[PDB]
Amino acid sequence: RPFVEMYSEIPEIIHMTEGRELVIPCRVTSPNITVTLKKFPLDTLIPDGKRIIWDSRKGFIISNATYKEIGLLTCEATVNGHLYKTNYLTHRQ
Amino acid sequence: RPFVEMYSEIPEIIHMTEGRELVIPCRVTSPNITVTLKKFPLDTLIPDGKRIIWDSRKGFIISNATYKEIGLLTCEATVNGHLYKTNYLTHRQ
Ligand SMILES: [Co+2]
Ligand SMILES: [Co+2]
Ligand SMILES: [Co+2]
Secondary structure, three states: OOEOOOOOOOOEEEEEOOOOOEEEOOOEOOOOOOEEEEEOOOEEEOOEOOOEEEEOOOEEEEOOOOHHHOEEEEEEEEEOOEEEEEEEEEEEO | OOEOOOOOOOOEEEEEOOOOOEEEOOOEOOOOOOEEEEEOOOEEEOOOOOOEEEEOOOEEEEOOOOHHHOOEEEEEEEEOOEEEEEEEEEEEO
16 A cells, blocks of 8 residues: 555545645655656656645645646556556546 | 446546435436446445436436435446446535
8 A cells, every 4th residue: 555545446536726736645655655647548747846746745736736637637656566546536626 | 329428437526415406417318228326336226206316318316415425426328238337426515
């Protein structure tokens, strides 16, 4: 179990507001775990300065959410040869 | 194409309120299609024409939603020997 909260089967719903900070709360149980953030079904989002921040204690922080962040966001981690996914469905508050 | 709108990969978000009407809008392309309503992963919900009403042009109308209807609801239909599914995720504001 690399993720503290794991929504593999049914995604967790999270509210966002355009123009405001959005946390994708896939924090991990250990600092060695490598996490990838995806937006279904095409995009891989990488940590980048202040736009997208990774904090292993919190998850990914998107500094100012836009309508582009509306949809299915997935955190992925590979450990002990297995792939673990945790899924979030965002929509406006 | 038994369901007019088909949500498989990503379920469609439905806002619900306990004690109020809840519509699961899995309308179908013919009134001769039989549809079953399920709650993941265990339950089947049986329409009785009063508390839960089926209307092929609308979907399932649940009169008095309870917390038991919070979660992943699935409409299933078997036509021409094949099973089709469409998925809804109900959500409390
Ligand atoms: Co295994
Ligand atoms: Co066939
Ligand atoms: Co909402």
